[PDB]
């Protein structure tokens, strides 16, 4: 399977846009973490089935599938988040009806730390000006690489996580930029992935926070896609 | 769950 | 400055290794974070004089510096543990004289575990066979990317510059380097996460009274030396 | 002190 086709599985796997079916309105400590559970919720179902839709990925062990899945929801939620962000300076696109600014961060504690996190590496894919098959490379590669017959599933994952890589260098080579430059822009969007882990270690740790505490409703996926970071 | 959605469609 | 010069200059900034000995008595939970703690106290000392000595880095405001250091030293000692480990299968090379084996890290509740991330990404940086030159541009390039703010992105590419630049010298096929270059900087979110466990566990140690924390240590540790 | 350090030596 060439790198082309494989970005085109990737594009296929891509699960649908969501909406909380939220009424516009203004933001409350409430209906903010209220609505953020909620889309995690949503979004955590669509991305088991894209996991599935990655070639391979069904083939490895139903240990690796669950761990991996465990390990790196959040950075791929956060992930998708910044691609849908990117064409919006100063705003955070969570999802359509889901649309939240610095200054609406300030009303819940804690978590104004982690939308300028966000922002900021929102910010500097855009000024690298991340492109739409580039994102879908990334994204693969944030599953692939997150955690870590019994075996086999090893080199299995190895070869698929080496795949997405070279379908990341492809894409990255028909930009048509010198070989110099593409071997910088490999590493820049590499180097991001480390932010991308940060933000999201911060946003669990606050989650985690407000599910102990109760002030969320904490929906079964969720909720333990939650707890098995925790154990 | 996400086991049964891992081996459900 | 001449990507070879830049790698040339971040090997003579290479820190010198820090003399550690191993407590005579088997290690009790309290000897072992006695030891971990006291090295990475005199390794701290180190790293911001190496820091000092990367291109352009004390050309960075003073305010940028402080937050580059806070936010990555567990990073690196542990980037320069793996390094150190590499030649050494099972084992953890904190230092010369501290050789510790997965084994010993029972003694301490929640330690083993990191002890494990840390010999696993030891094995993929082995399995690559990680080079010298590579290894020194990657070191830095993790203080580089713990993100003036202009000046940090200019420095970020010379070094990538260099990196790149050590890969092509070793002569396998364009399309070979640029797989190369991708396999090592993944394995950064790796160090990343061990990092934050690591100094997870350091602050519950703390907290658990199980091993005080000094004063270099404990600023590094708390991150907000500037409030 | 971190800043020391940075600025002092
Ligand atoms: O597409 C996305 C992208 C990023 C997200 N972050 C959350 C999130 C969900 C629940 C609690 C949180 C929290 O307490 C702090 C920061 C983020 C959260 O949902 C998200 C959905
Ligand atoms: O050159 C190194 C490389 C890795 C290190 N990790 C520590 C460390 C120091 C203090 C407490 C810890 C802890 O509580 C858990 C894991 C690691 C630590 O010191 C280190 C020194």
Redesign the interface.
């Given at each position: 399977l060439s790198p082309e086709q494989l970005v085109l599985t990737l594009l296929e796997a891509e699960p649908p846009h969501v909406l909380i079916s939220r009424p516009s309105a203004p933001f409350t400590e409430a209906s903010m973490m209220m609505s953020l559970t909620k889309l995690a919720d949503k979004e955590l179902v669509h991305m088991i089935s894209w996991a599935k839709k990655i070639p391979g990925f069904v083939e490895l062990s139903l240990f690796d599938q669950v761990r991996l899945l465990e390990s790196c929801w959040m950075e791929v939620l956060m992930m998708g988040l910044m691609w849908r962000s990117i064409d919006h300076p100063g705003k955070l696109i969570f999802a359509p009806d889901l649309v939240l600014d610095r200054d609406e961060g300030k009303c819940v504690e804690g978590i104004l730390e982690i939308f300028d996190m966000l922002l900021a590496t929102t910010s500097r894919f855009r000024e690298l000006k991340l492109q739409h098959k580039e994102y879908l490379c990334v994204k693969a590669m944030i599953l692939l690489n997150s955690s870590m017959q019994d075996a086999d599933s090893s080199r299995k994952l190895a070869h698929l996580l080496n795949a997405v890589t070279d379908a990341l260098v492809w894409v990255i080579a028909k930009s048509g930029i010198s070989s110099q430059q593409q071997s910088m822009r490999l590493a820049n969007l590499l180097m991001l992935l480390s932010h991308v882990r940060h933000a999201s270690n911060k946003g669990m740790e606050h989650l985690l926070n407000m599910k102990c505490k109760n002030v969320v409703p904490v929906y079964d996926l969720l909720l333990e896609m939650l707890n098995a970071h925790v154990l | 769950?996400?086991?049964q959605?891992?081996?459900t469609?």
């Open positions: - | 769950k996400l086991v959605l891992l081996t469609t």
